[PDB]
Amino acid sequence: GSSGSSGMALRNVPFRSEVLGWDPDSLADYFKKLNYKDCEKAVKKYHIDGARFLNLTENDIQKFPKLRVPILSKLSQEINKNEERRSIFT
Numbered sequence: 001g002s003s004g005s006s007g008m009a010l011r012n013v014p015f016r017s018e019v020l021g022w023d024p025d026s027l028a029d030y031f032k033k034l035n036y037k038d039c040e041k042a043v044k045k046y047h048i049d050g051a052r053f054l055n056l057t058e059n060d061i062q063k064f065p066k067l068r069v070p071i072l073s074k075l076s077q078e079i080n081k082n083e084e085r086r087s088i089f090t
Contacts, residue, residue: 010075015044016083022050034075039068056081 005011014030021029024047031040042048046063056076061069 007033009077010034010071013075014084016054016080017049019054019079022053024052027052027053032042036068036071039072048056052073 012034019027025044027048027050028040028043030050031037031043042063042065043053048060048063052060053072054076056073061073064072
């Protein structure tokens with residue numbers, strides 16, 4: 001190989017079905033891997049499960065930092081699109 005990797009930004013994203021079955025205590029781990037310790041905190045403190053992440057709304061974003069607000073809104077969508085195409089007609 002040649003191209004090196006690190007893991008400190010939007011590079012890896014989980015699957016939707018996977019997040020839909022996550023928890024407000026487990027989802028925090030996902031962030032810990034993305035160097036998002038500021039997010040994982042609220043995820044456990046406010047008890048925000050994966051299902052709540054993908055549905056990041058103005059009511060949820062308010063419970064997040066202005067430094068990760070846009071990051072979570074952009075990430076939450078990345079997962080929704082990561083859903084394994086099976087037979088969705090919507």
